[PDB]
C-alpha cells in the first residue's frame, strides 16, 4: 500500500508537466468564428485566404478559424459555446437587396447576434461582399433601392466620406446607406465593451488576411485600455 501512493504520485507529476507545455499553446492562439447569412460568398472568402476548422499564421501569430455548417437551423442554441472567441466574422452580400428580401433577413440576424446575452463582450468584423455586381446593378436602371428600402429617398452622402478613385457618385450613396444600416444597430445598444469593423470586400481582393490581423490587434488594445481605465 505504501508503494501504491508513490505510484499514483509519479503518474500525476508526469501529467502536470504535459499540461504546462500545452497551456503556452492555448494562450498564444486566437479563435475566430465565421458566420454568414447564406449565399453570401462565404466559401470564396475562406478559400482565397459537422464543423470545419482552418489554421493560418500571419506575422508569427497563430489564428484558428471555425465555420459551422452541420447545424443549419433557424434557432441557434450552440452559439453560447463561442463566448470566449476574439472576434466574430460576419459575411453578407450587399447586392441582395431585391432578391427574395435577403438584406432585411441579414440585418435581423445581425441584430439578434449583437444583443445576445452571452455575446455581450465580443466584437464583430463585418465583410460587405459582392461589390462589383452591386455597382453594376446600381448603375444599370433595371431596379432601384428606393422601391425596397423607402428610407433611401431622404439619404445623402456624408461629408466625411472616402469614395473610390473614379467611382460613380450613385454607387457611393448605396454603399454608405447599406453600411450605415448596420452601423445604426451597432451603435444603438453598444455600451462601450465591443465595437464593429465594417469593410467593403470584392471577389478579387487579396488583403483580406491583413484586415483581420489589424482588427484583432485593435480589439485587444482597446480591451486593455478599457481595463486600465484609460478609455
Amino acid at each position: 500500500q505504501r508503494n501504491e501512493e508513490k505510484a499514483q504520485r509519479e503518474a500525476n507529476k508526469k501529467i502536470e508537466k504535459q499540461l504546462q507545455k500545452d497551456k503556452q499553446v492555448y494562450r498564444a492562439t486566437h479563435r475566430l468564428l465565421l458566420l454568414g447569412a447564406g449565399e453570401s460568398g462565404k466559401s470564396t472568402i475562406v478559400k482565397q485566404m459537422g464543423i470545419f476548422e482552418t489554421k493560418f499564421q500571419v506575422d508569427k501569430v497563430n489564428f484558428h478559424m471555425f465555420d459551422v455548417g452541420g447545424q443549419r437551423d433557424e434557432r441557434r442554441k450552440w452559439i453560447q459555446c463561442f463566448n470566449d472567441v476574439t472576434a466574430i466574422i460576419f459575411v453578407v452580400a450587399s447586392s441582395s437587396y431585391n432578391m427574395v428580401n435577403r438584406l432585411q433577413e441579414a440585418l435581423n440576424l445581425f441584430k439578434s447576434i449583437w444583443n445576445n446575452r452571452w455575446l455581450r463582450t465580443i466584437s464583430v468584423i463585418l465583410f460587405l461582399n459582392k461589390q462589383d455586381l452591386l455597382a453594376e446593378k446600381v448603375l444599370a436602371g433595371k431596379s432601384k433601392i428606393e422601391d425596397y428600402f423607402p428610407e433611401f429617398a431622404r439619404y445623402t452622402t456624408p461629408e466625411d466620406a472616402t469614395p473610390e478613385p473614379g467611382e460613380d457618385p450613385r454607387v457611393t450613396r448605396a454603399k454608405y446607406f447599406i453600411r450605415d444600416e448596420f452601423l445604426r444597430i451597432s451603435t444603438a445598444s453598444g455600451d462601450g465593451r465591443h465595437y464593429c469593423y465594417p469593410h467593403f470586400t470584392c471577389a478579387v481582393d487579396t488583403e483580406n488576411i491583413r484586415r483581420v490581423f489589424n482588427d484583432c490587434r485593435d480589439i485587444i488594445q482597446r480591451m486593455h485600455l478599457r481595463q486600465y481605465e484609460l478609455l
Binding site: E5, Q8, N12, I15, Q18, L19, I51, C81
Partner: peptide
C-alpha cells in the same frame, strides 16, 4: 481520483468543442 486528488488519465480530443 476524488479521494487522493490525483489525475489518472488525460485524453486529448480531436475536436475541441465537446458538450
Amino acid at each position: 481520483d476524488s479521494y487522493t486528488t490525483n489525475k489518472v488519465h488525460a485524453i486529448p480530443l480531436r475536436s475541441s468543442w465537446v458538450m
